[PDB]
């Protein structure tokens, strides 16, 4: 049957772990403190991705029903709509954005099996989560780096799964901020500030944008073109940096930590002129990222959704 959903807590208390302004040197103790305070959150994101994956893999509505049941349970519970407790930075907000990405993607993947009683309980929950996140970004004091783009993913997914065109435009807007931040050398001036993790965060900035561009395709919309294919520039710099960190290691004062490019390559393999460049990355194996929707290999090959 459907296993019992964990109780949904209406509060996030996450902890920051970078020590320096570059957001590069992890404090392993504060990182293990966050891993323990966000393990219930991650376990649910993994569980709703896993079951949404299972429905895609074999069509079985039971996995889609158990996914919808868990989401509606956490919607009833008002999960994550509480106080985002500030320990040493905005990690609790970040965590809500990433959890929104996971649950909104997982809803999406199983949305063609939802009763009208499921949508009515799930849709206002995701729309509250999304508008709560957008409100953080209404403040011009908040620098719109990769966090803005990751927030865009879940906002956009909610707008698409709830048929909310103001949330769709909001997502599209963050995507456009991404593509417009991409310089002619393929870099991103704010992620170039991450020192050791400049490459890492370039990759981190790409995955949501690519993923946003795929949700666009679900409405029959090609956003990969924008700004003289600026996403091709950013993708180029990431994949040619996962093998050759020399450019980042030079352009940043710091030496890079090796990168295995994220599962966005699963999708961009099918969209670039020479998808062959992504053969090594592809071979590193089936990519799973709940925050990015789950089984990216599955969704790249057979589609984020079974039916439109």
Residue 22 lies in a domain: no
Torsion of CA 81, 43, 116, 156, to 10 degrees: 70
DSSP 18-32: B-STTS--B-HHHHH
Residues 6+ apart with CB under 8 A from 109: 52, 53, 55, 56, 64, 67, 293, 294, 299, 304, 305
> Beta-carbon neighbour count of residue 252 at 10 Å?
21
Residue 308 lies in a domain: no
179/94 Cα distance (integer angstroms):
21
CB–CB of 273/231 below 8 Å? Answer: no
Query: What φ, ψ does residue 289 adopt, rounded to 5°?
Result: -145, 100
Residue 16 lies in a domain: no
Element (H, E) at 294: strand 294-295
83, β-bridge pairs: 11
15/148 Cα distance (integer angstroms):
19
Residue 67 lies in a domain: yes
User: Angle at CA 166, nearest 5°, toward 69 and 46?
Assistant: 30
User: Angle at CA 140, nearest 5°, toward 139 and 143?
Assistant: 105
Residue 256 lies in a domain: yes
Instruction: For helices 116-137 and 165-181, give the axis angle rounded to 10 degrees.
Output: 40
CB–CB of 196/253 below 8 Å? Answer: no
| Residue range(s) defining the domain that contains residue 116 | 28-302
Token pair in block for residue 188: 């991103």
DSSP 132-166: HHHHHHTSTTS--SHHHHHHHHHHHHHHHHHT-HH
Instruction: For helices 146-162 and 165-181, give the axis angle rounded to 10 degrees.
Output: 150
**CATH at 154:** 1.50.10.100
3-class SS of residue 106 = helix
Q: How many domains does the chain have?
A: 1
248/79 Cα distance (integer angstroms):
40
Residue 38 lies in a domain: yes
Residue 6 lies in a domain: no
CB–CB of 71/120 below 8 Å? Answer: no
Residue 9 lies in a domain: no
Resolution (A): 2.5
Query: What φ, ψ does residue 187 adopt, rounded to 5°?
Result: -90, 180
């Amino acid at each position: 049957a459907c296993p019992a959903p964990p109780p949904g807590q209406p509060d996030i208390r996450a902890i920051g772990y970078y020590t320096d302004k570059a957001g590069s040197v992890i404090d392993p103790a504060l990182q293990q403190q966050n891993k323990d305070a966000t393990a219930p959150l991650d376990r649910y994101a993994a569980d709703v991705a896993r079951m949404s994956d299972d429905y895609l893999r074999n069509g079985d509505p039971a996995a889609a029903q158990c996914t919808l049941s868990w989401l509606g349970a956490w919607a009833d519970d008002g999960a994550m709509l509480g106080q985002m407790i500030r320990v040493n930075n905005d990690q609790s907000f970040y965590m809500r954005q990433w959890m929104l990405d996971a649950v909104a993607m997982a809803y999406l993947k199983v949305h063609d099996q939802a009763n009208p009683q499921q949508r009515a309980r799930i849709d206002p929950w995701l729309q509250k989560l999304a508008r709560a996140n957008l409100a953080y970004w209404d403040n011009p004091k908040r620098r719109r780096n990769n966090h803005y783009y990751w927030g865009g993913l879940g906002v956009l997914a909610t707008g698409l799964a709830t048929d909310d065109d103001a949330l769709w435009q909001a997502g599209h807007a963050a995507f456009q901020k991404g593509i417009d931040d991409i310089q002619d050398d393929g870099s991103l001036p704010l992620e170039m500030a991450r020192g050791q993790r400049a490459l890492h965060y370039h990759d981190y900035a790409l995955a949501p944008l690519v993923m946003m561009a795929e949700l666009a395709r679900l409405r029959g919309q090609d956003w990969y073109a924008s700004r003289n294919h600026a996403i091709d520039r950013l993708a180029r710099r990431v994949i040619e940096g996962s093998r050759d960190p020399a450019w980042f290691n030079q352009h940043t004062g710091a030496a890079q930590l090796p990168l295995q490019a994220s599962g966005w390559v699963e999708f961009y393999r099918l969209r670039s002129p020479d998808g062959g460049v992504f053969d090594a990355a592809h071979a590193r194996g089936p990519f799973h990222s709940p925050r990015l929707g789950g089984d990216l290999t599955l969704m790249a090959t057979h589609g984020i959704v079974r039916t439109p």
